[PDB]
Design a protein around this ligand. Sequence first.
Ligand SMILES: *C(=O)/C=C/c1ccc(O)cc1
Length: 125
Amino acid sequence: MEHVAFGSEDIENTLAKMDDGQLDGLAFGAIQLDGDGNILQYNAAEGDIVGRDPKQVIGKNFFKDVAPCTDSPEFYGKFKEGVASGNLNTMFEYTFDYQMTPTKVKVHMKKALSGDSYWVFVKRV
Ligand SMILES: *C(=O)/C=C/c1ccc(O)cc1
Protein backbone atom coordinates (compact mmCIF):
# COMPACT_ATOMS: atom_id res chain seq x y z
CA MET A 1 0.00 0.00 0.00
CA GLU A 2 1.53 3.46 -0.52
CA HIS A 3 2.31 4.96 2.93
CA VAL A 4 0.22 8.16 2.63
CA ALA A 5 -2.57 9.28 5.02
CA PHE A 6 -5.73 11.03 3.81
CA GLY A 7 -5.51 14.74 4.60
CA SER A 8 -1.72 14.82 5.04
CA GLU A 9 -0.18 18.30 4.84
CA ASP A 10 1.91 17.95 1.79
CA ILE A 11 -0.18 15.35 -0.02
CA GLU A 12 0.01 16.98 -3.46
CA ASN A 13 3.83 16.90 -3.31
CA THR A 14 3.86 13.23 -2.23
CA LEU A 15 1.52 12.30 -5.09
CA ALA A 16 3.66 14.03 -7.71
CA LYS A 17 6.07 10.95 -7.66
CA MET A 18 3.39 8.30 -8.32
CA ASP A 19 2.74 6.42 -11.57
CA ASP A 20 -0.64 4.87 -12.33
CA GLY A 21 0.02 1.73 -10.33
CA GLN A 22 1.28 3.81 -7.47
CA LEU A 23 -1.86 5.91 -7.25
CA ASP A 24 -3.90 2.69 -7.35
CA GLY A 25 -1.98 1.66 -4.17
CA LEU A 26 -3.47 4.52 -2.02
CA ALA A 27 -5.79 3.81 0.93
CA PHE A 28 -8.31 6.44 -0.32
CA GLY A 29 -9.87 7.59 -3.57
CA ALA A 30 -7.90 10.08 -5.67
CA ILE A 31 -9.18 12.04 -8.72
CA GLN A 32 -7.14 14.67 -10.59
CA LEU A 33 -9.11 17.22 -12.66
CA ASP A 34 -8.19 20.03 -15.09
CA GLY A 35 -9.72 23.48 -14.55
CA ASP A 36 -12.92 22.70 -16.41
CA GLY A 37 -13.42 19.43 -14.52
CA ASN A 38 -12.12 16.96 -17.09
CA ILE A 39 -10.77 13.82 -15.39
CA LEU A 40 -6.97 13.40 -15.78
CA GLN A 41 -6.33 10.70 -13.17
CA TYR A 42 -8.71 8.34 -11.33
CA ASN A 43 -7.46 5.61 -9.01
CA ALA A 44 -8.69 2.08 -8.29
CA ALA A 45 -9.76 2.91 -4.70
CA GLU A 46 -12.12 5.65 -5.96
CA GLY A 47 -13.63 3.37 -8.59
CA ASP A 48 -14.24 0.74 -5.89
CA ILE A 49 -16.14 3.16 -3.59
CA VAL A 50 -18.51 4.46 -6.32
CA GLY A 51 -18.70 1.61 -8.85
CA ARG A 52 -16.91 3.42 -11.70
CA ASP A 53 -14.21 2.15 -14.11
CA PRO A 54 -11.13 4.42 -14.29
CA LYS A 55 -10.69 3.76 -18.02
CA GLN A 56 -14.29 4.77 -18.80
CA VAL A 57 -14.21 8.00 -16.84
CA ILE A 58 -10.73 9.45 -17.61
CA GLY A 59 -11.24 12.10 -20.28
CA LYS A 60 -14.92 12.76 -19.30
CA ASN A 61 -16.15 15.82 -17.43
CA PHE A 62 -16.70 14.99 -13.75
CA PHE A 63 -19.57 17.45 -13.25
CA LYS A 64 -21.44 16.92 -16.48
CA ASP A 65 -21.00 13.27 -17.28
CA VAL A 66 -19.90 11.21 -14.26
CA ALA A 67 -21.05 12.85 -10.99
CA PRO A 68 -24.17 15.01 -11.57
CA CYS A 69 -24.93 14.96 -7.81
CA THR A 70 -21.83 17.23 -7.48
CA ASP A 71 -23.07 19.75 -10.09
CA SER A 72 -24.15 22.31 -7.45
CA PRO A 73 -22.72 25.36 -5.60
CA GLU A 74 -21.82 23.05 -2.69
CA PHE A 75 -19.29 20.93 -4.67
CA TYR A 76 -18.69 22.21 -8.24
CA GLY A 77 -18.94 25.75 -6.85
CA LYS A 78 -16.09 25.19 -4.34
CA PHE A 79 -13.99 23.66 -7.09
CA LYS A 80 -14.53 26.47 -9.57
CA GLU A 81 -13.68 29.12 -6.99
CA GLY A 82 -10.42 27.31 -6.22
CA VAL A 83 -9.52 27.10 -9.88
CA ALA A 84 -10.23 30.76 -10.43
CA SER A 85 -8.21 32.03 -7.50
CA GLY A 86 -5.40 29.50 -7.46
CA ASN A 87 -6.24 28.73 -3.81
CA LEU A 88 -7.80 25.28 -3.20
CA ASN A 89 -7.53 23.39 0.12
CA THR A 90 -10.86 22.47 1.74
CA MET A 91 -12.58 19.45 3.31
CA PHE A 92 -16.28 18.57 3.73
CA GLU A 93 -18.74 15.71 4.04
CA TYR A 94 -20.92 14.77 1.06
CA THR A 95 -23.28 12.01 -0.07
CA PHE A 96 -22.65 10.19 -3.33
CA ASP A 97 -25.90 8.58 -4.48
CA TYR A 98 -26.03 8.39 -8.33
CA GLN A 99 -25.92 4.78 -9.66
CA MET A 100 -24.66 3.47 -6.31
CA THR A 101 -25.88 2.85 -2.77
CA PRO A 102 -26.04 6.27 -1.03
CA THR A 103 -22.63 6.64 0.61
CA LYS A 104 -21.44 9.32 3.03
CA VAL A 105 -17.86 10.40 2.24
CA LYS A 106 -15.21 12.82 3.44
CA VAL A 107 -13.91 14.92 0.50
CA HIS A 108 -10.61 16.88 0.40
CA MET A 109 -10.05 19.25 -2.54
CA LYS A 110 -6.45 20.47 -3.00
CA LYS A 111 -4.54 22.20 -5.83
CA ALA A 112 -1.97 19.95 -7.46
CA LEU A 113 1.78 20.65 -7.58
CA SER A 114 1.32 21.89 -11.15
CA GLY A 115 -0.84 24.90 -10.94
CA ASP A 116 -3.33 23.86 -13.59
CA SER A 117 -4.68 20.62 -12.11
CA TYR A 118 -6.66 19.88 -8.97
CA TRP A 119 -7.14 16.88 -6.68
CA VAL A 120 -10.39 15.51 -5.25
CA PHE A 121 -9.65 12.93 -2.49
CA VAL A 122 -12.40 10.70 -1.06
CA LYS A 123 -12.74 8.31 1.87
CA ARG A 124 -15.68 6.62 3.59
CA VAL A 125 -17.11 8.08 6.86
C1 LIG B 1 -22.98 12.01 -7.66
O1 LIG B 1 -23.55 11.94 -8.81
C2 LIG B 1 -21.71 11.41 -7.42
C3 LIG B 1 -21.11 10.57 -8.31
C4 LIG B 1 -19.72 10.19 -8.33
C5 LIG B 1 -18.84 10.56 -7.31
C6 LIG B 1 -17.51 10.24 -7.34
C7 LIG B 1 -16.99 9.49 -8.38
O2 LIG B 1 -15.71 9.13 -8.40
C8 LIG B 1 -17.86 9.07 -9.42
C9 LIG B 1 -19.19 9.43 -9.37
